[PDB]
Design an enzyme around this catalytic site. Sequence first.
Site, mmCIF file in Angstrom:
data_model
loop_
_atom_site.group_PDB
_atom_site.id
_atom_site.type_symbol
_atom_site.label_atom_id
_atom_site.label_comp_id
_atom_site.label_asym_id
_atom_site.label_seq_id
_atom_site.Cartn_x
_atom_site.Cartn_y
_atom_site.Cartn_z
ATOM 1 C CD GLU A 39 -1.083 0.286 3.574
ATOM 2 O OE1 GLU A 39 -1.592 1.462 3.727
ATOM 3 O OE2 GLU A 39 -0.971 -0.736 4.694
ATOM 4 C CG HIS B 146 -9.324 5.090 6.903
ATOM 5 N ND1 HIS B 146 -9.721 6.145 7.047
ATOM 6 C CD2 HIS B 146 -8.153 4.973 7.128
ATOM 7 C CE1 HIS B 146 -8.915 6.945 7.319
ATOM 8 N NE2 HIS B 146 -7.814 6.428 7.361
#
Length: 107
Positions: free
Chosen positions: A70, A99
Site C-alpha cells: 500500500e 480506509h
Amino acid sequence: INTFDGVADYLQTYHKLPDNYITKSEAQALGWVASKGNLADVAPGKSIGGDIFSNREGKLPGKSGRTWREADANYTSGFRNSDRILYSSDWLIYKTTDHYQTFTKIR
C-alpha cells in the site's frame, strides 16, 4: 508524485514507488509520531508507502505468490488521510478512499 494516476502509472512502468515514499518504520526512525500528525515536520515532502498490506479479509484478489503493498495518495501534511493505493507484485492497482473498506480497480 502522490496522486492515484501518477503513482499507478509510475509503478506499472518502474515497478517501485517514486522517491517521495518512505515506510512506516523508516518514518518512525526519523521521529514520526502518528499521534502528533508530524510527518511533514520530520520528513518534508515524503508520504507513507511501501509496506505490505495483509488482505486478511480477502477483499483484494489473492493468488499464490501475489503480495500486496500500500501507499498513501494525496498526502501533503498533518494526519494521514483515508486515501490508499493498493498494488500487487503483478502490478494490479486498486484504490481505496475509505480506509480499506472498499476497493475499485484503477489499473
